[PDB]
Design a protein around this ligand. Structure first.
Ligand SMILES: [Ca+2]
Ligand SMILES: [Ca+2]
Ligand SMILES: [Ca+2]
Ligand SMILES: [Ca+2]
Ligand SMILES: [Ca+2]
Lengths: 49, 35, 49, 78, 311, 104, 52, 78
């Protein structure tokens, strides 16, 4: 689940198929600014640690 | 306008350089409508 | 801990673009219409909206 | 976008409140607002030095150079 | 050799990108901070910027840095290059786009450099935390103690298998190319570059000109000019407009990769131990929040875990 | 700040040197509240700066080899606008009405 | 009076049960969560949520 | 004193990792780490400058001095 221990899961540290479950949502760029703002649930691994 | 351009019904001439590139360059849109 | 990779946004002036699906973990794509971005050199796009 | 008559637009393409069009502060990085301006006059109670700086008459010939040039204290003036 | 580490960085150039705080207000900063990596233990953080450090237009020189001054790339000696979060950070090393700094905890990360009378700074909101190693929450690497394994960003520039993609730069919008001239918008093309122009005056005209072109429109506001110069590539920054087609041109190795290292952790004072019938009495006088854990060696561990912050 | 005995110039500063008024170019004029503050603008007696939270407000400037500073006890707090206690202006978010000292 | 940018906390995960709303809140900063019933008794709730 | 087989002993006596024995960084204060290094060559696809620099061929005579002396743009080359 997002923000939980298993938010990011990979079969091995060198695999090319990564499972990611975060509420990554793109926000509208601010008026007149070229940037890609986004909101996301803080890493569940850091939380677990 | 020379043969290198296509006159739109609005009166502007579509240059072959942008006869079809996604954005209409004349009020008639004869470029993107003619893609 | 995950890393959020954010490629350069496609700023289409005087027109519109469409998002497509890609095989990336938690991939997000959204088209924000009515932007009038400015760069160091001034207004990037001509059309207002 | 193009801005209402309540706002001034700099050559950079960005808009600045019309009250900021000429007030001595470059409000847009390009400086288009202050690049075009004109100086205002001063009351008859004030003296004007050679550089055009205004100073009150009570400061004229008082021994202190109250302007960029010494005209307020110049012998030719006093 | 040193040049072997810049073989790919020589193909990239600095760029100007949006910075949330250029001192007092948002601006397009040549030192814009792209990323802050702060997961190392002893407060080591790696900051990725849009400026190039260790490269000059003429080659490699760790004393020099290169940054964009508008359309023109400027190369200057590093002068008072500093990193600040809540207090000045010690700089460990620097590499193209990357700065390695030793920073204390703070709510922000500020990067900036001086160029004569000019000052270029970029402050981003980013919680930098000090992560102590072990069972004691020390606030600064101690002089002496127990040497424990830790995660650190190495000071070495060498390629260790981590790369970032560098892409062909997108259209660089720059209205300084347009001049009214004889009341007739002229497009000035810098030598060796191409200028895309887009005018939507009564005579709608657009195209790519390689040389000075006089358009039919009479007002600069009616036209846009974008400089197309692919001599040098740029990182695919999320703050730069993407170019058309497949803009991918190469890979740039990530310097100062995270590595396993040995960190000195604090060693709490030796407890006073008093003995009573079937009872152990410990008098703990810690210097920093110190974790105390106990367990029985029988069939029931009955574990205890508590942080001791005061005697 | 911005005034000299000879006229007006935002690059110049004027201060009293005993009984004599001295005017110098602004040299490392700084504001510090537990950390360096970014200067917004200055006018007459007033200095506008963006300071992080701190217990003290330090103001000072240099005049050649001399350093003139003044530190006063004053709790400077960051007051986030809205329903979230953020510690620094975000790069992006919701634009909410707030009270600011204009730089003009 | 001016406009200041304020953070937007991450959108919570919303789970629905019989007559029950379950929110999983993962804020970045102390975030104020408030709720009220739309009935005759608002029974408002107000708490600052600092941790998940 | 002798270091591990996978280490290099600077003249100062301090052991250094053998991988660091020659690179852009002097890993020991004495600097003897890099004193004995040897300069690398560069691919034939890169125009070697007169003063010993080496720049990609596509930059040669491109209108911009890429070598520290402008050899790539000097009339001797084009
Ligand atoms: Ca077209
Ligand atoms: Ca103004
Ligand atoms: Ca006088
Ligand atoms: Ca070495
Ligand atoms: Ca060249």
């Amino acid at each position: 689940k997002a923000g939980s221990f298993g938010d990011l899961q990979s079969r091995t540290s060198t695999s090319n198929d990564l499972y990611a479950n975060t509420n990554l949502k793109l926000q509208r760029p601010q008026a007149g600014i070229v940037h890609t703002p986004f909101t996301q649930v803080p890493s569940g691994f850091e939380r677990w640690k | 306008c020379p043969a290198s351009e296509i006159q739109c019904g609005s009166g502007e001439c579509i240059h072959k350089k942008w006869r079809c590139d996604g954005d209409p360059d004349c009020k008639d849109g004869s470029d993107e409508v003619n893609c | 801990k995950y890393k959020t990779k954010v490629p350069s946004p496609v700023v289409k002036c005087c027109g519109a673009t469409q998002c497509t699906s890609k095989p990336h973990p938690d991939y997000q794509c959204q088209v924000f219409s009515g932007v009038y971005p400015f760069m160091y050199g001034g207004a990037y796009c001509f059309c207002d909206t | 976008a193009k801005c209402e008559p309540s706002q001034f637009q700099c050559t950079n393409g960005r808009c600045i409140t019309l009250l900021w069009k000429c007030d001595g502060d470059e409000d847009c990085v390009d400086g288009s607002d202050e690049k075009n301006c004109v100086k205002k006059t001063c009351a008859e109670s004030d003296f004007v030095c050679n550089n055009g700086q205004c100073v009150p008459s009570r400061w004229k010939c008082d021994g202190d150079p109250d302007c960029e040039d010494g005209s307020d204290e110049s012998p030719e003036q006093c | 050799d040193l040049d072997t580490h810049f073989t790919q960085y020589k193909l990239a150039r600095p760029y100007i990108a949006d910075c949330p705080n250029c001192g007092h207000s948002r601006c397009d900063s040549p030192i814009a901070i792209e990323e802050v990596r702060g997961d190392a233990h002893a407060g080591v953080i790696r900051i990725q910027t849009s400026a190039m450090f260790g490269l000059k237009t003429d080659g490699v020189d760790l004393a020099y840095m290169s940054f964009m001054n508008g359309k023109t790339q400027k190369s200057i000696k590093i002068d008072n290059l500093h990193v600040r979060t809540s207090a000045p950070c010690s700089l460990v090393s620097h590499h193209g786009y990357y700065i390695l700094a030793q920073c204390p905890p703070g709510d922000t990360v500020t990067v900036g450099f001086h160029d004569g009378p000019n000052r270029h700074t970029c402050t981003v909101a980013h919680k930098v935390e000090f992560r102590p190693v072990g069972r004691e929450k020390y606030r600064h690497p101690p002089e002496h103690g127990v040497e424990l394994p830790c995660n650190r960003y190495t000071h070495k520039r060498a390629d260790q298998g981590h790369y970032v993609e560098m892409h062909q730069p997108g259209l660089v919008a720059d209205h300084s190319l347009l001049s009214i001239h004889s009341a007739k918008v002229k497009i000035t093309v810098p030598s060796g570059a191409q200028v895309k122009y887009y005018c939507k005056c009564p005579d709608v005209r657009k195209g790519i000109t390689s040389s000075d072109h006089t358009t039919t429109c009479t007002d600069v506001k009616q036209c846009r000019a974008y400089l197309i110069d692919n001599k040098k590539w740029v990182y695919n920054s999320g703050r730069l407009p993407r170019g058309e087609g497949d803009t991918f041109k190469g890979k740039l190795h990530v310097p100062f990769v995270p590595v396993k290292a040995k960190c000195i952790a604090t060693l709490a004072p030796e407890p006073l131990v008093e003995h009573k019938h079937r009872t152990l009495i410990l008098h703990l006088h810690p210097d920093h929040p110190t974790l105390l854990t106990t367990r029985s060696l029988g069939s029931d561990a009955n574990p205890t875990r508590q942080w001791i912050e005061r005697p």
